[PDB]
Design a binder for this molecule. Structure first.
Ligand SMILES: Nc1nc2c(ncn2[C@@H]2O[C@H](COP(=O)(O)OP(=O)(O)NP(=O)(O)O)[C@@H](O)[C@H]2O)c(=O)[nH]1
Ligand SMILES: Nc1nc2c(ncn2[C@@H]2O[C@H](COP(=O)(O)OP(=O)(O)NP(=O)(O)O)[C@@H](O)[C@H]2O)c(=O)[nH]1
Ligand SMILES: [Mg+2]
Ligand SMILES: [Mg+2]
Lengths: 512, 512
């Protein structure tokens, strides 16, 4: 939210106060000013980066489409998110894709590390020679064949990673700078047809040449300076980009987390996810920020056992009932999309699934939404309590069973679907938290971390001057005492300004 | 299969031949007789242990019930297989459960290792004092609380493991011997009600006090000396019993493997599974034996993307079309069970699901078979090509939708289900391989590994004696030469006996 003028001046006042503390070695050794300086850095809030770190194929990229109620991020079964990605606010005329390339220096360093692990006996990887690129990729292919297949061996996986990296550079030597990280853009006319297509081709390929794709977008969730960050599934075979995902989660460059967790589908927390929770716990202050989201909830509608397991898990480990949500992004995002559709469209079988509908032979094949919409109308869910006499016939195709239903019960029934999936709870909760809670919470935590610091300074000063007053040229002594006393008057002025900022923010845990 | 009398004598002949080789340091250094001795050890075949190593919740225990067409192994979502388990042939009067307990020495060693990792500052873990057991379990509970929940921390997981181990010993100090591994049994009257119930209570609890449960059973797949071994999911939180699973897979105590793989559900091979494939590859000879089984295939009926991914995976990595099978044990095993049921039963809603049907509140809740039977009759599958006008209604309960269908289309339709799931291919293929292929294959591999050994010996002997004959007391020299020549005559006799055994076995790669 926008900054009141006292809160605008507060940066100077807090830096000045920290300098007044640093002046005395006793307080400098006693107190970790860096913590307050970091909390101030957050309070300045040029960004507030929300990280969707979560398990492999847990649907986190889908879930960001659910929060945006728009298709942006590419999403498929298996790995489809092999690169860090950002979404940021921009106005209608400003919507664009901005890439960011690794340099030759980085690509060469990575290729050298891979070759060393592979025991690829090659000298300087002068990939500026297509001949050398050919030789090294032939080595990689030979290794992959001798390992016997792309996942027969860790050596095969790393060889395939090197092979993809080399092919990426060969495709991109026009754009990769030797030392700089080149900036390159896709521009919006038909955002989906041109722009997002050129996006996923540089994303869903998992091409390691990029380290960032930025999307600029109008959706109001972005507008207040909040940046949605997506990350690969931390069970990625490219171990370094998973470790960089940990870097992005851990480093103060970010502080928000959404964890996307399998237990509804998996049945229990995986060691992959407990490692993530430990790494979150290690950060000094994130744990208050962090949310849990259970995804693929729909599988609990079908099985008693998974629903019992998940209930037991939530009531055991996850009492934080304001920070836990159940969702199925696949049903919510398409549900909202389906509400836009029309009967003449065939309810999104054109203009939504039009790519997926064309099968391996190009004939009509069922998009997953339809098979787990029919599995929601028949067989499962709560329609028993509605008026909807929905029924699904095994002598009609999977699409006819959908077109018929939506052609008569449709627009009412889609709201029953959405409110069963619960994305309207999740998007509501984040929409509330990111505007209303987060700005006060960042100022409240700043004031809270300042409170021991200010108490320590007040105690040190008052105990010194009570010691001096209890014990027993005056113009010199008074010049020193009045200079430090005027520093204390500045401390009082700054704390008055901070308390006025907090009062304007309706924060009452004010400083002494 | 039963052993012909030449093949019965072959053990002596092969040991004797190996001694004739060992006599000469040149061959002893040149050749690894231990390989042939191991192949002979397999050829003697007092056991042939088949190991169902495969991913966490990949359904391998279910799949063994599918191979047996009987319930034996406990099975649930999440971990439900926390212990090594064996199934062996016995006759109708002999069917029994045989446990095998860890000793006090092992339990104490494990508890000490855990306490050391936990930094539990306790002396000798004299768990013979219930007071000490109480103190250590209170430490474990306090640690788990400070970590903040059973999967908040690796330290929490290991504390919970120690807590379960201690409670297990407290429950079992009547039966645990201090140094010996106690043997204890459950005996069959109502095998399911008494025996298998007392089984899962010592299995599905994941109580670490046991290291083996043996089941003795009549099913013909066991009868020819083949022992089915089940193992925990190698992504177990108890790292040691996973490493022991690796021990059981790797060590010559076993040689057969069935890998049970998620990619239909997961979308790709996990690093968990590639580690397993590498560990299999490291064993010197298993790789010819090993089978791949894709399980949770049914999810590919619903999604085009998973079916395409799995087809691409199989055609890339898994050309071994006689060693790859697609299955869904959940549909096959219950399908065969359902065929036994009757309409008055309500087709297994009594006498099969009678435990599961009683919900958390005891009311009727849907067993997973019914929800992914209705999802197979409606919406998915191939019934389009059958006569069956099956339909599923959203205004009727999940059980009424099942009872109605089976009450009119039932017994025909269950065969369409089973032959879609394909368990009748898998059980047929293993049934053929374990009798017909395996016994010849073990003798053929024994003969093949003998063939370099016999060629090396023949070359060494003939090159020595051609050297001597090409160069230039005779009773002494001839006593030596004729003794070694009679050893060569014994070699000829043994190789004649082996070739006669192979001929009786219709094996034609015979020795010179
Ligand atoms: N039934 C169902 N399927 C879901 C749900 N969420 C995700 N999926 C499945 O998973 C896909 C999501 O793809 P994607 O967003 O790339 O998943 P991801 O977690 O980002 N994969 P990665 O680990 O590579 O980052 C969907 O297309 C669908 O197949 C859900 O709530 N229900
Ligand atoms: N739909 C479906 N579910 C299956 C299938 N196979 C297994 N499951 C699910 O997984 C359960 C199998 O439990 P279990 O045999 O204990 O699995 P596991 O792989 O042995 N678990 P663990 O890793 O602890 O050894 C079934 O009850 C069902 O919920 C399948 O083919 N289809
Ligand atoms: Mg993804
Ligand atoms: Mg299991």
């Amino acid at each position: 939210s926008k900054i009141a003028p006292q809160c605008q001046n507060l940066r100077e006042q807090v830096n000045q106060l920290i300098e007044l503390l640093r002046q005395e070695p006793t307080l400098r050794s006693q107190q970790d000013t860096s913590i307050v300086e970091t909390a101030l850095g957050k309070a300045l809030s040029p960004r507030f980066e929300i990280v969707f770190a979560g398990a492999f194929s847990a649907g986190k990229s889908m879930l960001i489409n659910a929060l945006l109620e728009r298709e942006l991020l590419y999403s498929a079964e298996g790995h489809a998110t092999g690169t860090e990605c950002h979404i940021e606010y921009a106005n209608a005329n400003e919507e664009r894709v901005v890439l960011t390339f690794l340099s030759e220096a980085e690509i060469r360093q990575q290729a050298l590390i891979l070759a060393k692990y592979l025991n690829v006996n090659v000298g300087d990887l002068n990939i500026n020679q297509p001949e050398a690129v050919k030789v090294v990729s032939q080595y990689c292919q030979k290794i992959i064949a001798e390992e016997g297949g792309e996942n027969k061996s860790e050596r095969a996986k790393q060889a395939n990673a090197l092979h993809l990296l080399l092919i990426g550079f060969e495709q991109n030597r026009e754009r990769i700078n030797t030392v700089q990280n080149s900036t390159y853009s896709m521009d919006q006319l038909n955002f989906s047809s041109l722009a997002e297509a050129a996006g996923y081709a540089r994303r869903g390929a998992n091409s390691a040449v990029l380290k960032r794709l930025d999307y600029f977008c109008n959706h109001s969730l972005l507008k207040d300076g909040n940046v949605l960050v997506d990350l690969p599934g931390i069970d990625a075979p490219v171990k370094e980009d998973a470790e960089r995902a940990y870097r992005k989660i851990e480093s103060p460059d970010t502080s928000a987390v959404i964890c996307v967790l399998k237990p509804a589908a998996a049945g229990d927390m995986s060691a992959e996810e407990t490692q993530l929770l430990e790494r979150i716990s290690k950060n000094h202050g994130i744990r208050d920020r962090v949310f849990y989201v259970f995804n693929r909830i729909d599988d609990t509608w079908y099985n008693t056992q998974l629903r019992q397991r998940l209930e037991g898990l939530i009531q055991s480990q996850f009492r934080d009932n304001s920070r836990v949500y159940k969702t199925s992004g696949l049903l919510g995002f398409y549900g909202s999309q389906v509400k836009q559709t029309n009967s003449s469209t065939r309810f999104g079988l054109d203009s939504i699934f039009a790519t997926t509908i064309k099968g391996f032979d190009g004939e009509e094949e069922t998009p997953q939404f339809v098979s787990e919409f029919n599995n929601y109308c028949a067989n499962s869910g709560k329609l028993l309590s509605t008026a909807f006499r929905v029924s699904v016939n095994g002598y009609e195709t999977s699409n006819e069973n959908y077109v018929r239903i939506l052609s008569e019960w449709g627009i009412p029934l889609v709201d029953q679907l959405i409110h069963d999936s619960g994305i309207e709870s999740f998007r509501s909760g984040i929409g509330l938290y990111l505007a209303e809670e987060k700005y006060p919470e960042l100022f409240a935590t700043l004031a809270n971390d300042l409170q021991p610091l200010c108490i320590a300074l007040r105690q040190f000063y008052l105990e010194n001057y009570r010691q001096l007053d209890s014990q027993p040229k005056i113009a010199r002594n008074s010049r020193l005492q009045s200079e430090i006393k005027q520093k204390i008057d500045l401390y009082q002025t700054s704390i008055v300004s901070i308390n006025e900022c907090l009062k304007a923010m309706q924060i009452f845990e004010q400083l002494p």
